[PDB]
Amino acid sequence: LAEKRPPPAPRLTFRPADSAADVVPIAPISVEVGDGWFQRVALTNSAGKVVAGAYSRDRTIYTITEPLGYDTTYTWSGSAVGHDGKAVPVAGKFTTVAPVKTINAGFQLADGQTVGIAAPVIIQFDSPISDKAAVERALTVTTDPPVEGGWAWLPDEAQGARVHWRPREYYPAGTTVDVDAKLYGLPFGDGAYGAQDMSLHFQIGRRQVVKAEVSSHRIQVVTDAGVIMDFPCSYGEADLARNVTRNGIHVVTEKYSDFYMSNPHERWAVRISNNGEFIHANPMSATNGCINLSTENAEQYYRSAVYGDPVEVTGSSIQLSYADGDIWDWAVDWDTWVSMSALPPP
Numbered sequence: 543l544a545e546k547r548p549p550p551a552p553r554l555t556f557r558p559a560d561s562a563a564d565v566v567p568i569a570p571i572s573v574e575v576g577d578g579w580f581q582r583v584a585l586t587n588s589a590g591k592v593v594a595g596a597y598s599r600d601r602t603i604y605t606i607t608e609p610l611g612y613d614t615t616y617t618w619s620g621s622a623v624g625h626d627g628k629a630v631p632v633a634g635k636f637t638t639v640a641p642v643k644t645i646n647a648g649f650q651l652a653d654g655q656t657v658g659i660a661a662p663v664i665i666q667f668d669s670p671i672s673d674k675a676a677v678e679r680a681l682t683v684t685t686d687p688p689v690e691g692g693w694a695w696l697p698d699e700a701q702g703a704r705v706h707w708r709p710r711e712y713y714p715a716g717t718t719v720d721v722d723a724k725l726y727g728l729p730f731g732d733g734a735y736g737a738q739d740m741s742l743h744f745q746i747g748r749r750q751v752v753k754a755e756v757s758s759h760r761i762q763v764v765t766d767a768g769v770i771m772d773f774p775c776s777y778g779e780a781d782l783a784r785n786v787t788r789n790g791i792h793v794v795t796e797k798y799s800d801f802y803m804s805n806p807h808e809r810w811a812v813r814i815s816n817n818g819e820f821i822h823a824n825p826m827s828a829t830n831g832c833i834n835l836s837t838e839n840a841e842q843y844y845r846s847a848v849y850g851d852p853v854e855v856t857g858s859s860i861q862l863s864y865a866d867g868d869i870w871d872w873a874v875d876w877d878t879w880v881s882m883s884a885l886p887p888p
Contacts, residue, residue, distance in 0.1 A: 792872075
């Protein structure tokens, strides 16, 4: 009487497909239907935590907005209505990748920390890294004002790989810094995967430069206010190479009102290298390896020093090197720094 052909059943498309394994936890997750709309859709993990997602306006595509765990099986549930009014089930599952190890990371600065104009940004991993190149492309640095700088890999330590970021010149005073590392779901190398996304905000403090000419027996501290400290001092006399204040731009890191160090008890000490070079107080009259001040002067200097303040050392036979230990970043040419990037340069 009135004959014809039955019309369209809905057509579900899962990205990722049912029973997929080794799914990367930051891949795009979705279920798309055709010839019909979604009545309900929801995705849960093995423990029944509902994962937040979102429909498309047409309500024919559902998508996950938050990223997933590792080594976790997720399942789909819901229905989509066809032109019938016939509801059809939306049901499926997949398991995310389960890496050999999650490699972590951690900046050596805190959020909101205020530092000197030569502060490097140091990320320290808790493992070696096959694809250093890939971990780098995840990194982003934003400064205000904008400033030229660059990532660079140093020799893996006993904790693991490490990477430093350095602006080519000093930060302008007051510069805000915002660094972002998108490492979650990131294949570091082999079956190892990045622990988690990281981010850091910090600011550069007042411009303060130290001027330390070994032959002058003087040290100067210079700021926006001008020379604010000119002190007589004693440098390391180049008679034995254990006892020469190394040459080049140093960076202040630690400081102690009172410390006890059984070398390779200080007062008002400021560390300017992991080789054990300090600016501090000690009984003298101008030699050694440090930079000696009167107790009174060392105290004045000390109270003004700040993590990341540069100390310019000049006129010395022995350049500051990797051998001296962190921070040896500013004691190499920009081109050689750029060379240490795991990606090729502009």
